[PDB]
C-alpha cells in the first residue's frame, strides 16, 4: 500500500483558504490515518490524528476530513508560521508507509 | 414451528462440491477428488459450528458430454460409458488412464451408460475413531488429524475414440445422512483463506455506525 | 409378469429427494458409538446461551475490545442519553454478528422474545441510578428523560443489584432500548469514576424459525 | 471450605460443571490415584492496566509438574479430567471484569498465511502465553496470530461464551471454578501430540484504580487431575 | 469386529478376469475364454489358500463399442446387439463367425442391445465330483484334473455391417456365491510363472536385515 | 397398471452389489454334498496355528534353513544379546512372511495379542539360563543386561523346561522382544556346545480385523 | 429381482392424470389453518343468490 500526496509543491498567500489531498491505493480505515508537520531542519510533530481530531497545542485553523481512499487537509486561514512540509501516514497492513510530502511555501 | 432447526433438517442438504473435466484421447484425461468437507465455503461454515460429527454419505454424479471439434468425414459414435472408481483409505492409486489400479478387486466402482438416471452410490461411516473431527489441536505437521480420511474418487471413459474427441464434465453432489453432532462452536467471523488450515487475517468485529446513541 | 406403468417424473434427479440408496461398501462392520459429552439435538440450544453485544461500534472501537463496553462517567448534566440502539432486524445493527444473530441469518421467518441482561462492571463503592426505556414498535424514540419515563421502563439501581434483566419481543420501525441517566455516579475519595457497562442477549425460549436460506456473511 | 487432596490443601468458600457430566472412569489400563490427584498450583501472572489476555494448553502445562510429568513420558496413552480453580485478589477500590473460559480443541492460526506455528510458540511449558492488543506482523516466519478481538482462532471474541465459562467480576465476585470432563473422539489418546483443552482468561473491562493503590492484581490458577487412567504393562 | 474374516466376506468379491476385443466385418472377430480361476494373479492367490472349494458363479459383461475409421459418405448405424454364448463342458465349439454351433439348442446364450443395463447371468455348480479341486497330485500329463471343467464363453455381433466397421471390447467380471472351503493351505511365496502348472524358480524366504540383534 | 417411478441409480452396475440373478442352466439337479474333513468357517482359524519365525535373516541365511535357527554358544562374556527384533508392523521385519503375517497383510486395521513360543533344540545334558525382556511401546530398547532385568521379563531355565511361552499385544515405536545371556551353557565332556533355538508365533484368539485390501506381496 | 413388464401408455404425459408427485421442498412445516368465514364447497351455492336482470337493454 502506497500513499500519493498532491500537489508536491503548493504556494499560498497569507489570508486565503488552502487544501491538500492524500490518496491511497487501497482502502484505508478512517481511524488509522494521521498527519504530521515537519519544519525546516527540525524533528517532525504530530498534527492531526485519526483523520479529524486535533493534536495538543495545535491551532484551531486546521481541520482534516475525508473517508474511504481519499483524505484531505484544509487550512482555513494561512498564517506566517504554517509554512512547512506535511506528510500523511496510514496502516492497512505492515509496514506503516508515509506519504511523499506536500511543501507549503508562503507568498 | 420449531422443527426446521433440528440437526437432521439443517445439515442433510445437497450441495455441488466439485466440477471437473476430462477428455478421452489426450492420455491424461481422468478426474480426481480427495473427499473432504473443506472444499466449498458455504458448506464449510455450516459444518464448523460443531466439533465432532458422524454421518453416512450419499454421492450423485451428473455426467454430461460435449463433442470436441474433430477433423472431418462423418463422425458417428455410439453411447458412451463412464467408470467412477472409489478408493478406500489406504488403497492403490492410479496415475495414468491405462493402469493396473483400475482393474483391481477391492475398489468398488460403478459403470454408467449415457441416457439413464444419474449414478448414485453411498459410502458408510469409515473411520477408526468413533467420530469425525472437524478440528484438531495437535500434531500428526500441525493440525492434520490423519484419522478422518475418507478416500478419493476417480472418473474415466471406457470407450476408445475412433473418429472424434469427446470431453465430459462431472458435478459431484454431496449429502450427509443420519447426522449426529457434538459440542457446538461459535461461527467463524474472518474469511476463509486456505483449504488445509484455519489461517486468517485480522478483521474488525462488526460494521460500524456513526455514534453510540 | 406384473404390468407396470411409469408416471412422469421418473428418471429425474431432484436435489431434495429421499430414496433408498445402494451402499458402496457392505460387510464393513462399522465402528460403534461412544458417549461423548455435549450432544446438540436442535439449533435453538446454541442460541439460548448469552453473548456480549458490540453496542459501542463508532468506527474506531471495532478493531478492539472497547466495542463491548459502554462508557459511563459522572458528568454535570442531569438527564442524558447513555446509549440507544434500534431492534431493526439485520439492518447493520449491533445484534447482527452476535451468537443469536448468527443463527437467525440462516432463516427467513422467525418470531419470539429476547432476554436482555445488563451488568455493571465498575467499582464496589460507586452508586447511581439508570432508566431503561423500551419503546414499542410504532411509537417514536424518546427525545427527553421525561417522556422516556412515561413509556414502559425499568429503573435500575446500581448500589443494590448489579444485573438488570429485561425481556422484550423481536419480530422479522421495530423498537428502541434507549437508556438514560437518572442521577450521576456518586463516588468516594481515591476511587476512579469512569465505570463501564456490559450488555448481553439471548433467546427467550419460545421462538421459532422457518424457511432456511444461505447466509450473507460470505464473499 | 478447606478442601484437601493428596498432600496439598487450598481454601475455598459456586461451581459450573462441564457439559452436564461428571468426570468418571471407563489391552488393559491401570488407574493411579494416590500420586496424581493433587493441586498443581501454577505460578501467578500479573494483571496490569493495558493487559490483553492469557492462555494455557492444558495437558502441556503440567508436563514438568512432578509425578504427572513422569507418567506422561513413561506411558503412551491416557485420559484425564480436570478441576480448575481461578481466583484473583483485589481490594474494594479496584475495578474490572475477567472471562474464564475453557475451550476444547482450540486450533490456532499462524501469522504467515501459508505456514503453521511452531511448537515453542503455541504452549509455554508451565508459563502463560500472552495475547496482544495489536496485530502480529506478516513478515515473521512462524508465530501465532494473537489479535485478542479475534481470540487467535478467527472467531468473534464476544461469542466465546458458548463454551463452559464463568465470569469474574471484581465488584461482587472473586473466584471461579470449572470442572471439565474428557472430550475426545478416540477413547484414549496420546498426551504429547495433542492438547485437548485450552484455558483462556480475557479481561473485557480493563483494570482501573486511583493513584496510590497497588498497580497490579495477581491471578492464581490451580489445576487438579481427576479420574486419570493410563495404558501399559 | 470378527466377521469380515469370514469366508463369505473374503471370497465373494468382483474381479476383472478377461478383456478382449472383436470386430464385426473381419470374418475372424469373435471372443473366446475358457473359464478357469488361474487367470489373474491376485484372485489366484486368494483361492489357493484352500484345496477344495464349492461355489456358484455370477458373470457380468460390460460391453462397449468404438467406431473404426470407415471410408466416407455419411455413416449411420442403428443400435448394435451382441450374443454371449455359453458352452457347457462337453459341447459343440464354434470356429468361425457364421457357424452351426451358434444356432444350437442346448447352449444357453443371452442377447443384449446397447444402451441398457449390462447382461448378468449365473452358472450353477457343474461338476461330477462333490467339490472343485484347486490342486491335483496325479496324472490325467501331470496335474490336470479333468473333472473341474466349467465351460467356455463366446461373444459376437449379430448385426451385419453396411457402411462402417465397429470393434468392441468386453470385460468379463467374476463373482462366486455361497462359498464353502475345506482344508486350508499355506500361501504361495514364489512368483507365478505359468498358467497351467505350479512351476516356479527358487527364492529366498524373507527380505534380509543387517544383523541378528 | 401399477404406477412406478424410477429413482436415480437405476441402470448402473455397482461392483459390490447384491441382487437376485437369473440362472443360466436351470433343471440341472446339482451334485449333493459329502462330509469332507477340515472345513474352514473363518480366516482367523488359519492364523491360530503356530509357525516358525525367520529370526536369523542376515543376508546369507535367507536361502537356507539357517534362517530359522538362533545360534547359541558358550562364550566368555557374561551378559550379551542373543537376539532382538522389533514388533513394528510390516516394516521389513521378521513376522512379515509368516502365517500370521500373511493374513494380516490383507487387512488395514487389526488389533490383538500374540503368543510367542520358544523351544530349545539342543542336547539333553546342557543347561543354562536366559532372560526374555519385553519392552513396552514408548520405552527404549534395553542396552544392558541390568536395565533389561528392571523391565518386564521372564527368566527361562533350560535344564528344567524346554519351552517358554510369552504373551504380548500387537497393534497396527511398538516394542522389542530382546533376549539376553544370563549364564553360559554348561556342558559335560564329549557333548557339543553349539545349541540352537527355534521361535514360534500365533494369534492369541481375541483379535479382530477390518477393511480388506489387496496384498503387496505381488508384482 | 421382481420381474415386471411395462404396458403401453408408460412414458406419456396425460394432462388430466392423477399420480403421486415428488415434493420439491420437504421439511417445511406448513402454515396451519384459520377459521375464515364464508367457505364455498360447491359452485351451485354462488348461483342460489338473487341477481338483478337487465331486462331493459334497448341499445341506449
| CATH number for A63 | 2.60.40.10
Q: CA D117 to CA B138: how far, in whole Å?
A: 11
State the smallest CA–CA distance between residue D154 and chain C in angstroms.
Answer: 13
Q: What is the resolution of this structure in A?
A: 3.5
Chains meeting B at 3+ CB pairs closer than 8 A? C, D, E, F, G
CA distance C32 to chain E (A): 10
Count of C-beta atoms within a 10 Å radius of residue F190: 6
How far are the Cα atoms of E49, E116, E190, E209, F101 from residue F92, in angstroms, in the given order?
23, 49, 17, 8, 11
Contacts of G28 in chain B (CB under 8 A): 4
Select the residue from B182, B201, B205 to test the D interface by mutation, using most D Cβ atoms within 10 A: B201
Joined grid coordinates for residue B102: 483400475
Grid cell listed for A2: 502506497
Taking the alpha carbons of A43, A48, A49, A53 in that order, is the dihedral positive or negative?
positive
The answer to whether residues C154 and C119 touch, using CB atoms and an 8 Å cutoff, is no
Question: CA–CA separation, A69 vs B182, rounded Å?
Answer: 45
| Domain definitions of chain D by residue range | 1-233
Instruction: Say if A and G touch: at least 3 Cβ pairs within 8 Å.
Output: no
Q: What percent of the residues of chain C are helix, what percent strand, and what percent coil, each to the nearest 5?
A: 5, 30, 60
Residue recorded with cell 392424470: G17
DSSP state of B49: T
* Site of grid cell 496335474: E143
**Residue G34, min C-alpha distance to chain C (Å):** 19
- Altogether, the residues listed in chain F come to a count of 219
Verify whether the Cβ–Cβ distance B184 to D162 is below 8 Å: yes
Domain enclosing residue B95, as ranges = 1-213
CA distance C112 to E58: 62
Please name the residues between 20 and 39 in chain G that touch chain F, using a CB distance below 8 Å: 20, 22
D211 touches chain A (CB under 8 A): no
Number of Cα atoms under 13 Å in the Cβ half of residue B41: 13
C-alpha cell at F10: 437405476
Cell 530382546 belongs to F178
* E1 chain-C contacts, CB cut-off 8 A: 29
How far apart CA E194 and CA B159 sit, in angstroms, is 31
- Name which of B199, A91, B138 is nearest D112 in CA terms: B199
- Beta carbons of C172 and C109 less than 8 angstroms apart: yes
B205 closest CB neighbour out of D112, D156, D163: D156
Query: Residue C48 in contact with residue C114, Cβ under 8 Å?
Result: no
Side by side, the strands of the sheet bearing E81-87 are E33-34, E152-157, E81-87, E109-113
> Cα–Cα distance between E58 and F149 in angstroms, integer?
60
> Residue B118 contacts by C-beta under 8 Å, 6 or more apart in sequence?
B60, B61, B62, B63, B112, C13, F8, F9
Q: How far is A29 from chain D (nearest CA, A)?
A: 15
Exposure of C144 in the CB half-sphere (CA atoms within 13 A): 3
Closest residue on chain F to B91 (Cα)? F213
**Chain F residues 170-209 within an 8 A CB cutoff of chain C:** none
Parallel/antiparallel/unpaired status of strands A34-38 and A45-49: antiparallel
Return d(Cα G15, Cα C8) in angstroms, integer. Answer: 11
> Which residues are paired to D129 by β-bridges?
D55
Grid coordinates representing G22? Answer: 415428488
If one counts the domains in chain E, the total is 1
Burial (CB < 10 A; 0-12, 13-18, 19+), residue C191, is buried
**Between the CA of residue D39 and those of D9, D33, D58, D161, D196, what are the distances in Å?**
8, 13, 14, 26, 20
Interface chains of chain A (3 or more CB pairs under 8 Å): C, D
CB contact (8 A) between residue D233 and residue F136:
yes
Is there a contact between C27 and E1 if contact means CB atoms under 8 Å apart? Answer: no
Copy the grid coordinates of residue C139: 411509537
Residue range of the domain that includes A78: 3-106
Phi, psi of F103 (to 5 degrees): -85, -35
CA distance E78 to chain F (A): 21
Q: Dihedral sign, CA of F20, F25, F29, F33?
A: negative
C-alpha separations of C110 from B128, C97, C134, C200, E154 in Å = 41, 17, 21, 20, 68
Alpha-carbon gap, residue B82 to B97, rounded angstroms:
13
Q: Which of B68, B73, B171, B59 is nearest to B109 (CA)?
A: B59
Task: List the domain boundaries for chain F.
Answer: 1-219
Q: Which of D79, D80, D86, D24 is nearest to D218 (CA)?
A: D86
Computed from CA positions of residues E199, E201, E206, E207, in that sequence, does the dihedral angle turn out positive or negative?
negative
Q: For the structural domain made of D1-233, what CATH number should be given? A: 2.60.120.20
Contacts of F136 (CB under 8 A, 6+ apart): D76, D232, D233, F151, F152, F175
Which residues are F182's β-sheet partners?
Answer: none
Question: Where do the H-state alpha helices sit in chain B?
Answer: 8-11, 41-47
G11 reaches F (C-beta below 8 A): no
The D-side interface with B (CB below 8 A) comprises: 19, 57, 104-110, 112-114, 116-117, 119, 135, 145, 147, 149-150, 153-160, 162-163, 183, 185-187, 193-196, 198
Residues of A in contact with D139 (CB under 8 A): 94
Judge whether C27 is closer than 8 Å to chain E, CB to CB.
Answer: yes
Contacting chains of C (3 CB pairs or more, <8 Å) are A, B, D, E, F, G
Strand partners for D87: D175, D220
Burial class (CB within 10 angstroms; exposed 0-12, middle 13-18, buried 19+) of D30:
exposed
Chains G and B touch (3+ CB pairs under 8 A): yes
Separation CA F219–CA F199 (nearest Å): 30
CA torsion, points B183, B186, B188, B194, in degrees to nearest 10?
Answer: -30
Q: Could you give the 3-state DSSP secondary structure of residue A85?
A: strand
The burial of D201, by beta-carbon neighbours within 10 Å (0-12 exposed, 13-18 middle, 19 or more buried), is given as buried
* Residue in the block written with cell 447482527: C96
B109 by Cβ neighbours in 10 Å (0-12 / 13-18 / 19+) ranks as buried
Give the span between the Cα atoms of B201 and B191, in whole angstroms: 8
Convert B71-90 into a string of H (helix), E (strand) and C (coil). CCCCCCCCCCEEEEEEECCC
Coil/strand/helix, residue E33: strand
CB-CB under 8 Å, F14 with B110 = yes
Which helix (H) or strand (E) element contains residue D122?
helix D119-122
CA distance to partner chain E, nearest, from residue B140 (Å): 27
F23 phi and psi angles, rounded to 5 deg: -80, 140
- Closest Cα of chain F to D74: distance in Å? 7
- As a whole number of angstroms, the distance between CA B110 and CA E29 comes to 28
Measured in degrees and rounded to the nearest 5, phi and psi for residue D5 equal: -150, 125
Whether residues B3 and G29 touch (CB distance < 8 A) is answered with: yes
Q: Would you call B210 and C212 a contact, using CB atoms and an 8 Å cutoff?
A: no
Distance from CA of D153 to the nearest CA of A (A): 19
G11–C10: do the CB atoms touch at under 8 Å?
yes
Rounded to a whole number of angstroms, the distance from the CA of F13 to the nearest CA of chain E is: 7
Method: cryo-EM
Decide: C80 and C181 in contact? Cβ < 8 Å: yes
G3: which chain F residues are within 8 Å (Cβ-Cβ)? none
The answer to whether B32 and B132 are in contact (CB under 8 A) is no
Chain C residues whose C-beta is within 8 A of a chain D C-beta are: 34, 36-38, 46, 49-54, 63-65, 67-69, 97-99, 102, 119-125, 162, 190-192, 194-196, 198
Cβ neighbours of A29 in C, within 8 Å:
63
Indicate the SS3 state at residue C92. coil
Phi, psi of B103 (to 5 degrees): -90, 25
Query: For residue D32, what is the DSSP state?
Result: -
Inter-residue contact E162 to E152 (CB < 8 Å): no
Chain B residues close to C83, C-beta within 8 Å: 212-213
Q: Which helix (H) or strand (E) holds E59?
A: strand E50-67
- C-beta neighbour count of C68 within 10 angstroms: 23
Amino acid at each position: 500500500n502506497v500513499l500519493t500526496q498532491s500537489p508536491p509543491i503548493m504556494s499560498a498567500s497569507p489570508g486565503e483558504k488552502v487544501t491538500m489531498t492524500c490518496r491511497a491505493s487501497s482502502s484505508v480505515s478512517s481511524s488509522y490515518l494521521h498527519w504530521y508537520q515537519q519544519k525546516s531542519g527540525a524533528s517532525p510533530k504530530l498534527w492531526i490524528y485519526s483523520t479529524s481530531n486535533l493534536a495538543s497545542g495545535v491551532p484551531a485553523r486546521f481541520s482534516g476530513s475525508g473517508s474511504g481512499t481519499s483524505y484531505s487537509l484544509t487550512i482555513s486561514s494561512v498564517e506566517a508560521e504554517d509554512a512547512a512540509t506535511y506528510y500523511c501516514q496510514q496502516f492497512s497492513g505492515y509496514p506503516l508507509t508515509f506519504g511523499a510530502g506536500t511543501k507549503l511555501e508562503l507568498k | 414451528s420449531r422443527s426446521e432447526s433440528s440437526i437432521e433438517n439443517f445439515l442433510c442438504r445437497s450441495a455441488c462440491v466439485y466440477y471437473a473435466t476430462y477428455t478421452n484421447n489426450s492420455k491424461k484425461g481422468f478426474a480426481e477428488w480427495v473427499i473432504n468437507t473443506r472444499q466449498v465455503a458455504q458448506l464449510r461454515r455450516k459444518l464448523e459450528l460443531f466439533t465432532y460429527l458422524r454421518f453416512d454419505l450419499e454421492l450423485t454424479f451428473v455426467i454430461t458430454s460435449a463433442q470436441q471439434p474433430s477433423t472431418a468425414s462423418s463422425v458417428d459414435a455410439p453411447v458412451q460409458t463412464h467408470q467412477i472408481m472409489y478408493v478406500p483409505p489406504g488403497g492403490p492409486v492410479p496415475t495414468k488412464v491405462k493402469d493396473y489400479a483400475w482393474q483391481t478387486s477391492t475398489n468398488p466402482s460403478v459403470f454408467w451408460t449415457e441416457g439413464n438416471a444419474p449414478p448414485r452410490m453411498s459410502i458408510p461411516f469409515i473411520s477408526i475413531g468413533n467420530a469425525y473431527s472437524c478440528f484438531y489441536d495437535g500434531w500428526t505437521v500441525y493440525g492434520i488429524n490423519t484419522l478422518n480420511n475418507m478416500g478419493t474418487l476417480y472418473m474415466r471413459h471406457v470407450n476408445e475414440a475412433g473418429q472424434g474427441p469427446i470431453k465430459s464434465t462431472v458435478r459431484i453432489y454431496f449429502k450427509p445422512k443420519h447426522v449426529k453432532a457434538w459440542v457446538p462452536r461459535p461461527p467463524r467471523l474472518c474469511q476463509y483463506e486456505k483449504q488445509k488450515n484455519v489461517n486468517f487475517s485480522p478483521i474488525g468485529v462488526t460494521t460500524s455506525r456513526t455514534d453510540i446513541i | 409378469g406384473l404390468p407396470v406403468m411409469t408416471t412422469p417424473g421418473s428418471t429425474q434427479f431432484l436435489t431434495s429427494d429421499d430414496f433408498q440408496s445402494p451402499s458402496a461398501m457392505p460387510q464393513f462392520d462399522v465402528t460403534p458409538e461412544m458417549q461423548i459429552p455435549g450432544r446438540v439435538n436442535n439449533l435453538m440450544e446454541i442460541a439460548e446461551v448469552d453473548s456480549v453485544v458490540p453496542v459501542n461500534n463508532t468506527e474506531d472501537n471495532v478493531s478492539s475490545l472497547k466495542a463491548y463496553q459502554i462508557p459511563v462517567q459522572s458528568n454535570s448534566d442531569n438527564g442524558k442519553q447513555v446509549f440507544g440502539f434500534p431492534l431493526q432486524p439485520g439492518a447493520n445493527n449491533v445484534l447482527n454478528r452476535t451468537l443469536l444473530g448468527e443463527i437467525l441469518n440462516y432463516y427467513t421467518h422467525w418470531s419470539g422474545s429476547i432476554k436482555l441482561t445488563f451488568m455493571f462492571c465498575g467499582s464496589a463503592m460507586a452508586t447511581g441510578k439508570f432508566l431503561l426505556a423500551y419503546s414499542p414498535p410504532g411509537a417514536g424514540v424518546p427525545k427527553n428523560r421525561k417522556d422516556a419515563m412515561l413509556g414502559t421502563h425499568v429503573i435500575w439501581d446500581v448500589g443494590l443489584q448489579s444485573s438488570c434483566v429485561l425481556c422484550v419481543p423481536w419480530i422479522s420501525a421495530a423498537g428502541y432500548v434507549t437508556c438514560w441517566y437518572q442521577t450521576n455516579i456518586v463516588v468516594p475519595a481515591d476511587v476512579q469514576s469512569s465505570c463501564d457497562i456490559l450488555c448481553f442477549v439471548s433467546a427467550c425460549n419460545d421462538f421459532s424459525v422457518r424457511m432456511l436460506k444461505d447466509t450473507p456473511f460470505i464473499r | 471450605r478447606s478442601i484437601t487432596l493428596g498432600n496439598s490443601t487450598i481454601t475455598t468458600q459456586n461451581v459450573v460443571v462441564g457439559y452436564g457430566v461428571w468426570p468418571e472412569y471407563l489391552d488393559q489400563p491401570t488407574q493411579p490415584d494416590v500420586a496424581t490427584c493433587r493441586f498443581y498450583t501454577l505460578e501467578s501472572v500479573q494483571w496490569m492496566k493495558n493487559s490483553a489476555g492469557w492462555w494455557w494448553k492444558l495437558p502441556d502445562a503440567l508436563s514438568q509438574m512432578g509425578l504427572f510429568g513422569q507418567n506422561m513420558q513413561y506411558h503412551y496413552l491416557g485420559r484425564t479430567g480436570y478441576t480448575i480453580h481461578v481466583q484473583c485478589n483485589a481490594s474494594k477500590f479496584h475495578q474490572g471484569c475477567l472471562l474464564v473460559v475453557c475451550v476444547p480443541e482450540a486450533e490456532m492460526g499462524c501469522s504467515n498465511l501459508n505456514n503453521t506455528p511452531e511448537f515453542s510458540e503455541l504452549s509455554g511449558g508451565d508459563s502463560a502465553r500472552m495475547f496482544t492488543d495489536t496485530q502480529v506482523g506478516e513478515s515473521n516466519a512462524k508465530k501465532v496470530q494473537t489479535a485478542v478481538w479475534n481470540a487467535g482462532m478467527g472467531v468473534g471474541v464476544g461469542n466465546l461464551t458458548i463454551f463452559p465459562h464463568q465470569w469474574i467480576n471484581l465488584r461482587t465476585n472473586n473466584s471461579a471454578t470449572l470442572v471439565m470432563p474428557y472430550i475426545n473422539s478416540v477413547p484414549m489418546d496420546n498426551m504429547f501430540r495433542h492438547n485437548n483443552l485450552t484455558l483462556m482468561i480475557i479481561p473485557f473491562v480493563p483494570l482501573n484504580y486511583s493513584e496510590g493503590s497497588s498497580p497490579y492484581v495477581p491471578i492464581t490458577v490451580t489445576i487438579a487431575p481427576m479420574c486419570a487412567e493410563y495404558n501399559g504393562l
